[PDB]
Amino acid sequence: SMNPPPPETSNPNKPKRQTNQLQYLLRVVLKTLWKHQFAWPFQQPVDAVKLNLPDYYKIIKTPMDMGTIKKRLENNYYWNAQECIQDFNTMFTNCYIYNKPGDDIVLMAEALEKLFLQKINELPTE
Ligand SMILES: CCc1cc2c(s1)-[n+]1c(n[nH]c1C)CN=C2c1ccccc1Cl
């Protein structure tokens, strides 16, 4: 088994901005999820070798994680909040796609997602 390369967090010819909605995604939306007791599986790319989950990346073709999302926010990778919000949703969705209802990991994802939804509710106007 092998892990793929992680998602890129740097791309010089990608257009970037530092919008207030994007400043908010880092300061409220990501920093809220990051500190949570259930954040740890989501803090780095899934290591399918360490976990002995050789199927992971045969199933999940758009991996995403908060380690990547954090690096993207810090390295001003994004153009808009919707690109960043899409990364969060991809992260949650991947978890639900790969894992069975009632798995501990799904309960963890579901806790974080509740907060995530609660924070994006008060995303400022651009
Ligand atoms: C940090 C190490 C990880 C463990 C797990 C990770 S990532 N995971 C998986 N699917 N999506 C994500 C993210 C596979 N299940 C787990 C996992 C999490 C909690 C308890 C047990 C497991 Cl087995």
Swiss-Prot record:
Modification after translation, per record: Phosphorylation by CK2 disrupt the intramolecular binding between the bromo domain 2 and the NPS region and promotes binding between the NPS and the BID regions, leading to activate the protein and promote binding to acetylated histones. In absence of phosphorylation, BRD4 does not localize to p53/TP53 target gene promoters, phosphorylation promoting recruitment to p53/TP53 target promoters.
Signal peptide range in chain numbering: none
Domain Bromo: 17-123
Coiled coil: none
Cross-link Glycyl lysine isopeptide (Lys-Gly) (interchain with G-Cter in SUMO2), where in sequence: 58
Subcellular location: Nucleus; Chromosome
Effect the entry attributes to changing residue 104 to G: Found in a patient with a neurodevelopmental syndrome; uncertain significance
Protein origin, superkingdom: Eukaryota
Site feature (Acetylated histone binding) residues: 99
Expressing tissues: Ubiquitously expressed.
Record note on quaternary structure: Interacts with p53/TP53; the interaction is direct. Interacts (via CTD region) with CDK9 and CCNT1, acting as an associated component of P-TEFb complex. Interacts with RELA (when acetylated at 'Lys-310'). Interacts (via NET domain) with NSD3, CHD4, BICRA and ATAD5. The interaction with BICRA bridges BRD4 to the GBAF complex. Interacts (via NET domain) with JMJD6 (via JmjC and N-terminal domains); the interaction is stronger in presence of ssRNA and recruits JMJD6 on distal enhancers. Interacts with NSD3. Interacts with NIPBL.
Disease: Cornelia de Lange syndrome 6: A form of Cornelia de Lange syndrome, a clinically heterogeneous developmental disorder associated with malformations affecting multiple systems. It is characterized by facial dysmorphisms, abnormal hands and feet, growth delay, cognitive retardation, hirsutism, gastroesophageal dysfunction and cardiac, ophthalmologic and genitourinary anomalies. CDLS6 inheritance is autosomal dominant.
Assigned protein family: Belongs to the BET family.
Functional description taken from the UniProt entry: Chromatin reader protein that recognizes and binds acetylated histones and plays a key role in transmission of epigenetic memory across cell divisions and transcription regulation. Remains associated with acetylated chromatin throughout the entire cell cycle and provides epigenetic memory for postmitotic G1 gene transcription by preserving acetylated chromatin status and maintaining high-order chromatin structure. During interphase, plays a key role in regulating the transcription of signal-inducible genes by associating with the P-TEFb complex and recruiting it to promoters.
Note: JQ1, a thieno-triazolo-1,4-diazepine derivative, and I-BET, a benzodiazepine derivative, have been tested on tumors with success. Treatment with GSK1210151A (I-BET151, a I-BET derivative) has strong effets on mixed lineage leukemia and promotes myeloid differentiation and leukemia stem-cell depletion.
Domain notes: The NET domain mediates interaction with a number of chromatin proteins involved in transcription regulation (NSD3, JMJD6, CHD4, GLTSCR1 and ATAD5). The C-terminal (CTD) region mediates interaction and recruitment of CDK9 and CCNT1 subunits of the P-TEFb complex. It is also required for maintenance of higher-order chromatin structure.
Protein name: Bromodomain-containing protein 4
